[PDB]
Each structure stands twice: as C-alpha cells, then as structure tokens.
Automatic annotation (TrEMBL), chains A, B, C, D:
Phosphoenolpyruvate 2 binds at residues 91, 185, 233. It comes from Neisseria meningitidis serogroup B (strain ATCC BAA-335 / MC58). Stereospecific condensation of phosphoenolpyruvate (PEP) and D-erythrose-4-phosphate (E4P) giving rise to 3-deoxy-D-arabino-heptulosonate-7-phosphate (DAHP). It catalyses: D-erythrose 4-phosphate + phosphoenolpyruvate + H2O = 7-phospho-2-dehydro-3-deoxy-D-arabino-heptonate + phosphate. Pfam families: DAHP_synth_1. Keywords: Amino-acid biosynthesis, Aromatic amino acid biosynthesis, Metal-binding, Transferase. Pathway: Metabolic intermediate biosynthesis; chorismate biosynthesis; chorismate from D-erythrose 4-phosphate and phosphoenolpyruvate: step 1/7. This is Phospho-2-dehydro-3-deoxyheptonate aldolase. Mn(2+) binds at residues 60, 267, 301, 321. It is an enzyme of class 2 (transferase).
C-alpha cells in the first residue's frame, strides 16, 4: 500500500493518565474547600450579588514553581488585607500561545530546554496548584486544549479562554463543562460579539471529545456553565474606558447574558507596554468612583521583578509578556481596593 | 470535603478507539493509492509545480450517505472529463460549526434526532469515505478537533481549518501533523494575518495532546506540514476579486510562505446566497483568463438539488447552508475548466 | 544498566477491547431473554427446586462454526422435545487445555495454521455464541483465563472451571463474579475436595485483576456466585456410580454447600473411550430410576460425526477428544429423558 | 433487554497502570545488575554448571515492610558469608493462597483491614523489592496471576508457580514468558508429573492474554523459558528423601528436562509443623555429604521471630504459615553450607 497514515508525525508517546497524578497528588480537604468557596464567590460576582472586585493577578506565565510559591506568599497578605474590597486570585498560566517558534510553557517543556517532558510538566503543574491551594491562595489558568484540564481543573477556581480561541466551537464546548467560572476574551482585533456569543453557547449542554481520568478517549456530555463572562482586553484600539464598558454592557443585556465584565489591564489594552497597566487601573479606579456598576473584575500581569527577558536568567522575571514588579503591584491593588471601597459603600 | 471535579458534567462515555474502526474498515490498496496520489497532486498546486485548479466541491454538510454517494457518481464523470485542467475533490464535511442551538452534524448525531450516537457517526463517516475513495472520488473535510482525525484522516486528501479556529494554537499544531495539505481560512471578519501566521506556524514541528490509535491519551510530536495555504472566504467585505488576491499574495511573499491560494465562492463571499456562487466563479474565471497566477483552487458548495431545507424531506438537498444544484454545478465546472485551459496554455 | 524486563517475550500486541466486539455484535433482546432465563432455570437445578436434568452436550472443542451451527439446529429439536425432562444446553468450548504442542483453540488460532489471529478468533467466538442464542440454543463454555470472559460471558448460560484449574485461587475468584452458574471439576487424579473447596471459595466476595470493557487494567470486586456445583469427571478410576455419588453428596453436605452434582460421561469417566459414554449414561439412568436425588445434570461429548482426527479433514468430527456421533446422541438423550421422566413423576 | 453482563460484580475500579509505578520507582543501575547476575547464577544451578545450593528463604508472607527490611539486613550477612557454598535469595511472597476467608496479602490489602487498596499495595510491593535489591539482597516471589508481574517482575530473580497452579495452562504460559528462572511445585496430593509437564510446556513459546506496561489488554507472545525446574513439596506423604529425589531425577531425565531439583523444607514435607523444617534440612544435608547429585536448591520458611500469629500483634512474626525463627535459621543455613562445602569439594 501507499502510505496514508501519520506521514508527518515524528512520534506518538503515551502519557501517564490523570489518575496517576491524582493518586500522587490528591486534592486535600482544605484545598477542596478553598476551591468550592472561591468558585461560588466568583459566581456571585459574575451575577452581581457581591460587589467586590475579582482580581486575577500573577505572572504572564509560570516558568519556575519556587518563584511562583514565593510570589503567592506575598500576594496572600494582600489577599487577606483587601478581602472586603477585592477577591484576589493568583494567575497560574503554564503557557502563553505564540505564533513565532519559542518555549511552549511549563507543562509542555518543564526543563526549558526543548526536551518536552510532559509527564513531569503536568506533575509539576498539579503539584504547584495543590501547594497554592493548600497555602490559602486560589489559582486560575488558561485552558488551551480539551485534555490538560483532566489533570488539574479540580484545583482551578477561575478559567480563561483566550482571544485566539474564544470563537472556537470546541473551546466553547469545553467551557460548558468546566467546573469553574470562565471568562471569554474579546477577539485579537477587538471583536466583542464572539465573547458574547461564547457565553451564550457555553451556558448550554454540549458534547465534545476528550479522555477519561484513566486516559481513554471518551465523549463528554456537559451540563452548561452559567458562570461565564466577558473579558475586555483591547484590540486595534483599547476597550477599557467607560464608553466601551457601557456599549459592552448594552450588548450583553440585549443578548440576555450577564452585563458584568472583567477588564484586562495588560496585553492590547496596555499596548504590550507593562508600564501602562497602571494607567488602565487608574481609569478603572476612576470608573469605580463615578459609577462602574458593570465591572466585576480586572486582570493584571505582575511578577516579583518587572519587565521581561528572553532567557530565564533572572529569578521571578517573566520570559513571555512583560510584567509590572512588586512595588507597582502593591500600588495598583491599594488603588483598586481604595476605589472599590467607595463603590461598595454607595 | 467539598467536590471540585466534573461539577458540570452530565456524563462521560467511552468511545470506540480508532483501531476498532480501522479494523472493520481498513483502507484498501485503491483508496491508499488515490489518497497518496491526490495529496501529492495538490501539494504540486500549492507550490506552483502544476497549474491545474483544485476544486473543492460538494455539499455544505453530509446528512445522507446515499445522496452523497449518488452526488459522487455524477461528480466522478466531471472529475475525469476535466482532469487535465481541474483537480476535482469532493467536499465531505460532516458538521457545520455554529453558535446557535442545532443539528450537530453526522458524526455527532447521525440519526438526526438528538441522541448523539457518536460511535455510529464515526463509523458511517469512515464508511462513506472508504466508499468514496474506492469508487475513484478523493475527499476533503474540516477538522474541528484534535481527536476525530485519528478515525479517518487516512481517507482525506485535503483538510480545512475553519475561520473560527485558524488563530487557535492547538488547531495550528494539529495541522502541522496532518498527512494531507491544509487550507487555513481568513478570520470571520476578514483578517488574513491569522491565516498567513497559521501557515508559518504549521510548517514547523510541534507537540499537542491527542490519543493514540488505541484510544489512549498521548503526546504527539509532529514533523511540520509544508503544504499549507490560505483560503479567501470573505468577512466584513468579500475578498474573491483580483485586487484582494493581489493584496493577499503580496502579504504571503512578505511572510516567506507560498503565494498560491484558494478562493471560497461560498459563505461570506456569496453572502450566504447560493445563486451568487456562480457570480464569484465567473469573476475567478475572468482572472484566470487575464493572469490569475496566484490562484491554485476554489471552494464550491454543491448538491444534487439547489437551495436548502430545515428538515431532510427532499432527497439530495442541503439542511445546512444553501447549495447550487447539479445543473449549475455542471456549468460552473465547465466554466472554470475552459478558463483554466487558457491559463495553462500560457 | 542491565535489562531485566520482558527478557523472554517476543512481542506484546494490543487487542481490540471488548467494547469493539460488543459494538459489532451486541446482544439481542431474544438472546438476552434466553440467557437470563436459562441461568435462572439452571440455578433452580443446582439448589434442587426443579428435577429436570441439565445436559451439557456438544463437541469437545469448536474448530468450525458452521458445523457447530448445523450441530445446534439438530440439538434444538431435541431441546424442545425433551424440555419437560431435560434442560439441554450446548457445549461451546473453544479450547482443550493441553500439555503437548498443538492447536490452541478457535480463539487463539481461528485459522488453524499457527497464526494466532486472536482478534479474529474472539470475534468469531462471539458471533457463534450470538447466533446460537438467537436461534434458541443456549451455550456453555470453559473459562481458562480472566480476560476472555469480558468478550462473551454475557452470552453464556453455564460455565465450567476445568479439572486443571479448579484448585487455582485466581479461577475461583473469577467464578465468584461470573454471571452464570459454574461447575467445578474434581482433580485430574480424582480429588473431590478441591472442587468442594472451590464452591465455598466462589460463593464469597473476592477481588481479582482484570480488564474493563474498554480494555484497561482494573480491579474487579465480585459479589459471590451462589450457583456453583461440582462435576464428577473421574480420576485414577471413574467416579460416576451410585456409591461415588453418595460419598460426594455427604462431603458436599459436610462443607455446607449444595449436594446436587453433575456427572461427566466423558473424559476420565469414559477413560477417553467415546463408546463408553453410553454406558456411563446407562448407569446414570438406572440411578435416576431407583433414586438419584443428588444428580442435577450430566455432560456429554458429542458431534455430528463420531471419533476424532489429527487434522480437520472431515466435516463435523472432533480434532481434540473423540466424541459420540449424532445417532448415538439421539439414543443417549432418549435414554436420559425416559429415566428422568420417572424420577420427576415420583 | 434483560441484563446478562456483570450481574454479580460489585465494582470495577481502574487500576494504576504498571508505567505509573515504573515512573515513581524506576529500577536503578545496581538493582538491575543484581537481578541480571542472579538470574544467570540460578540458570547455572538449574543446568548443573555450578554446584552451589540455591536457598530460597524468608517469610511465608510479607505483611510488614520494616520487618522485611530488617530480616533482609541479617540475611545479607549470611548471604555473603556463605556465598561460595550457597546462593541465598530472599522469599518475598505477598499473599498466601487460601480456601477459607482470610487476609488476602500485602498487595490486595496493604492496610490489613479489608480496604483493598491495591494501588498502594502494588506501590508498596515494588518499593520493598527495589529497596531489597538496592542493598544487595535479590528477591523471589510467587506469581499468582497474569497481571501482577507487569508491576514488579523486573525486580525478581526467581519465581515460583505453586502446587495449586502448576497444572494450570495459563500459569504455564505465564512462566514461559517470565524473565526469571521458575520453579514448579508438585501437586498438593504429591503428583510430580504435573510439574514435569509444566517445565516441558514452559520451555516452548506461548500466547496468553495480559496487559501492557501502559495497562491495556494485549496479546503476549513468549519465547519460552529454558530455566524451569521442579520443587518437591510433599503430598499425602513427604517426598524429600534420597529415594524420592532419585525417582524424580529418573522421571525428569526420561522426559528430557533437567534432573536438578529444589526441595521445599516447609508445607507438606514438614507436615505443616515449622519444627520439622529442620529435620527435612538435616536429611538434605546427609544426601549432599554422600552424593546429592540432583539437588540444586532448598526452600525454607523463616522469619525474625519464630512461629505464627492469628493477628499481627508482634514484630517479625508470620500471620500466615508458621516459620522458624532467626536462631533456627542461622543453624539451618550453617548446616546446609557445611554439608554443601563437602559436596562441592569432591
Ligand atoms: N474535569 C473538568 C471538566 C472536564 C471533563 C472531562 C474532560 O474530558 C475535560 C474537562 C472540570 O472539572 O472542570
Ligand atoms: N493521523 C493524522 C495525524 C494525527 C496524529 C495523531 C493525532 O492524535 C491526531 C492527528 C494524519 O495522518 O493526518
Ligand atoms: N463480565 C463477566 C464478569 C467479569 C467481569 C470482569 C472481568 O474482568 C472478568 C469477568 C460476566 O458477566 O460474567
Ligand atoms: N514482564 C514479565 C513477563 C510478562 C510480560 C507481559 C505480561 O503481560 C506479563 C508478564 C517479565 O519480565 O518477566
Ligand atoms: Mn500575557
Ligand atoms: Mn457551508
Ligand atoms: Mn474434552
Ligand atoms: Mn507458606
């Protein structure tokens, strides 16, 4: 026969199934309680029942777990300190999607050297998330595929579907069966309709393909996710100001979905310049003081150290998108806490 | 000890692995030969080694195998008759992605009644593709997820990644290991950079998660797909005309990827009107007559009977997007054949 | 770094999982009814609620399914005719365990030429069992390992654990979770304790290692099989006469298990002389006339044609142990039917 | 559709696949060398190329790994002390086969409380075996089924098939693909032919059903095991003396298999009284000092503290068959080393 199968495949390696990771790193009672509780709390924010600000804040991507747990220990103090004004949740993204050839994230390539030790990667990803939850810091992440969630979704209190996948039917179907609340980002060029469309789609029951905990191909029948919302992350032009929030909210009401939204201070809203995250946060603060009824959260890309680097030389310094440092982070959260205390008190 | 896992999952059900369907419906010598040959012949059009026009043509979605087989028998005659000018490959899409609630396609819901007998669907799909190839008709389809291809990619001569997934990293990774040439559509609002980037991305080696033929979770390390191209399919504005082809070509050369492209006569370029497909085809024909050096194919939604219908009452009429009928198909193909006969003789 | 794993293994090949066979050959409504009620009917014989005689009768091993179906259609007329006196179930054994190099049975080597096409054999075995049941003929078999049952046990009305495996803990555990009544044979040298112990063991809950329907290693927690009994099949000397029955009954009563047993007319009771099966059946008929309260069934090795052959040249003639032909079978059943008519009438 | 499938199954639970354990506890360089060499050294005894006595000695069953490690540390000193005369390998059996309801072993029930935590049991079993090998004590075990060996056979230098399974075709097939040398015991009533038949059978190639390292059902094709021998373990009467050895040797040569055998000092050769293990060993000693040409090994049930316990209330005390203590073990080994010194020196 002429060959027709796997013509462009170098290798297919079997993967340790989720149950193997679950046996080594079973979720503890206290992590279980933190996740259940934070999921519910976030849901209240999504549907306008509590007026705290959800703050998803942390590195662009995790490239070292030691630095991440160190970051978490500082953030934990602010989480407790601002607990009446803000619901702080740590951003634990293992990979930034990239068009150009480059590092594929911590799950994919934990040794940062192109050896793609994914079993170790997933094991590390789960270990980190259990430790964070065990210390009192809830975690959030981006789900890029339909398989990785079986390894650690049980430890995630909030999920994101990125700008590049919000329109994708299979990612919407995934979101409809995710145990956590989910935010959908507007398209890379500013299209908001696709995120509005996605919350619609994700609240309904769907079927997609994936694997069981034991690692076998299966059909997943989901119940719908009622806790979805939009994230404004800019486009050609930023979309974070009051007028864009207003238009967005009107559109969400017309589609019959939640008009409470998140604003990303990073990415195309900061123009890929980390020193502008603070500008976006200040405008949001202004919005919260005047009115700001439709804002329920913000996203901030933050690290121990500011900026970015191509190689992982410097500890707690991003190797993907540039972040603000810890000093600026304390400044940003004091401000948001300050502004939302006034909103909550009106 | 609060629950955190599969909170919004109604059911998970095991799927028959690929090997079960490969065991019952193994590829034949003839089907292997046709797939292999057709994939090569198409790559030749992609890289400009041959100036025949690839015509991806057939129903919007397959909802009846008998009608598809009948359609194929008619198309076969014209595939042979035009074989020196056109490379005709049947469209065999099992689903049409959509945002609203509705029929999820032949793989997901073969009984067209909401039972989701996916084991049956996947079986019928492979059976139809094996039959089409055995009769002399090569097939093409859209790959919407990372698992379904293990079940029938071996029977597919050309693959599409739709507008909604072209920017998705995991779909680009998938394309990088598909055995067939792959077309990337421009975004739903007419964005071409995502498809140009996708070609660049898919030519490189990647890892993604999927399942082995035996249905177990796995790491797939791909080789890169050197045979990818863009498909112009409209957006806010149609992009089929000479001026758009030339803008696209310029952008492709500047990214250092192939400047040969496909034009979808349907969907947003026809504005969802099936009678405008013939208009787009004539415009393409006129370009091939004048120059048209960057056009390597077209896409046409065609069935035995023209139009569309909500319920599958009429034999051979679409229940998804509207199609041209057999009569206009004959004329479209005869038009494109003659226009390309001239381009070829230059 | 020395190799320590799989030193003496030539190949490990993956099987189609049971779900693959179950999907091609699902159990029909009618086959389900037959299996359900025959298991119940037999259970009534084991615990003494009904005085009909279970007759397990058919070839030593199946090597041709067509002969087995032709055998089955003749036997069916007799199953119907003697249904008030005899409960006739066909023997569908796929393999005779042996010590010397030879044919490994219809599952292991369905093509009978040493190519070990196990996927094909499991398929053929299931199809044969399905067709038998669909025609009205219940089936029985011997379970030699802990994995093959997942492929066809749903089609089996009565099971044997052979003389060579009755003492094996893992086989006793299997029996404890088999859906059918099970007969255990006495040891090759005549030891009855191992079968009495086996019945005891198998009535309890156990755990044993096996495979799920999807083919994954699993732990099976069984509930106990309350329907087990012994089979007197001879030893150094035959054990079929009234004295031996009576000694067995007492021992059975002493271990507090059912004192109804089965007598195998073949094997070491006939001493591998198929013409003696008739004399064993005549002894049993006499016991039934006189009393025989502890007999609930008999086993008989029977085919279309008598004797045995080394190669499968002659149609419907055994390639394992020698069987009685069809004419002698008619006599034997008539003999047993008439005798038990009088036992039942008392 | 009446139910016919799994009627008497309480629960099917997925088991961690072997690879999961092999990932947490990979074999080390040193353990590899110890396993590889010992297997070769045993092969040499089996085939008469060295006259050292193989000594399989250790607890009847392991129920505490701390005690097993302490026992091993003491045994190691003797292993080295007597290395020129004896090859001391540790008995590391996890379960003892039972007809009556009892503790089902360390693998099945590591917590000694009916929780059947088999994943943990298998993990513990592997861990113990890896530790033993790491400190320089090779290990030996009974293989009771066709799945457990995938989890630790790589750490085993000698395997036993017990009296209850020696006649079993599937265990013979298992043995034919085991990396270690294998001993087959004579039947529980003293039948030697089954063990002689077993060696014959196990030296040829076989197919049996099992699971891959990845935990999926598979067809195993073995190469044959050339290193099998019998074990004399008594029956209705003891079989350990010169005249039973002589007669066994004769039947062995006559069947064209190795006439070197092992004698079990325990079980039916001791009358199930641990105090008579020594009297058996004294007889073997006398045989060696006169001739003892056919003896290549002995088997001894020994522990730190002598005797049995109904429940595990004491350190280093058997909870299954009764074992001689350390004192009696020092004396037995001295006796054997001394007698065998004399055999080796002529
Ligand atoms: N386990 C995920 C949902 C999920 C289920 C099955 C899958 O295959 C994938 C994802 C959660 O609890 O959110
Ligand atoms: N088998 C596909 C490539 C592929 C391989 C593995 C997967 O999991 C998915 C897709 C092809 O030949 O095109
Ligand atoms: N399926 C078997 C019982 C069984 C279940 C699991 C196994 O792994 C083996 C046997 C029956 O219906 O009798
Ligand atoms: N792994 C075993 C042999 C074996 C192989 C496969 C199995 O499924 C079972 C046992 C050994 O090395 O001795
Ligand atoms: Mn980022
Ligand atoms: Mn369409
Ligand atoms: Mn027989
Ligand atoms: Mn013992």
């Amino acid at each position: 026969h002429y060959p027709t199968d796997d013509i462009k495949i170098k290798e297919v390696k079997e993967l340790l199934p989720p149950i193997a990771h679950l046996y080594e790193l079973p979720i503890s009672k206290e992590a279980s309680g933190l996740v259940h509780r934070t999921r519910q709390e976030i849901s209240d924010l999504v549907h306008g029942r509590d007026k705290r600000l959800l703050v998803i804040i942390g590195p662009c991507s995790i490239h070292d777990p030691k630095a991440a747990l160190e970051y978490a220990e500082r953030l934990l103090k602010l989480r407790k300190q601002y607990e009446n004004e803000l619901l702080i949740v740590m951003r634990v993204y293992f990979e930034k999607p990239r068009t150009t050839v480059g590092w594929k994230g911590l799950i994919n390539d934990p040794h940062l050297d192109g050896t793609f030790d994914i079993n170790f990667g997933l094991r590390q990803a789960r270990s980190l998330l259990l430790s964070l939850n065990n210390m009192g810091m809830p975690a959030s992440t981006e789900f890029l595929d339909m398989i990785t969630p079986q390894y650690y979704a049980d430890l995630i209190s909030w999920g994101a579907i990125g700008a590049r996948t919000t329109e994708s039917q299979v990612h919407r179907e995934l979101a409809s069966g995710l145990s956590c609340p989910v935010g959908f980002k507007n398209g890379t060029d500013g299209n908001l309709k696709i995120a509005i469309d996605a919350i619609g789609a994700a609240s309904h029951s769907h079927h997609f393909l994936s694997v069981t905990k034991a690692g076998h191909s299966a059909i997943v029948h989901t119940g719908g996710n009622p806790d979805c919302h939009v994230i404004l992350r800019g486009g050609k032009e930023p979309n974070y100001d009051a007028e864009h929030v207003s238009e967005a909210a009107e559109q969400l009401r017309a589609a019959g979905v939640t008009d409470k939204l998140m604003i990303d201070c990073s990415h195309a809203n900061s123009r890929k310049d980390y020193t502008r995250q603070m500008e976006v946060a200040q405008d949001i603060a202004a919005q919260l003081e005047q009115d700001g009824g439709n804002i329920m959260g913000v996203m901030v890309e933050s690290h121990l150290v500011e900026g970015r680097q191509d190689k992982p030389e410097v500890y707690g310094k991003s190797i993907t998108d540039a972040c603000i440092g810890w000093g600026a982070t304390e400044e940003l959260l004091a401000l948001l806490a300050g502004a939302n205390k006034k909103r909550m008190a009106r």
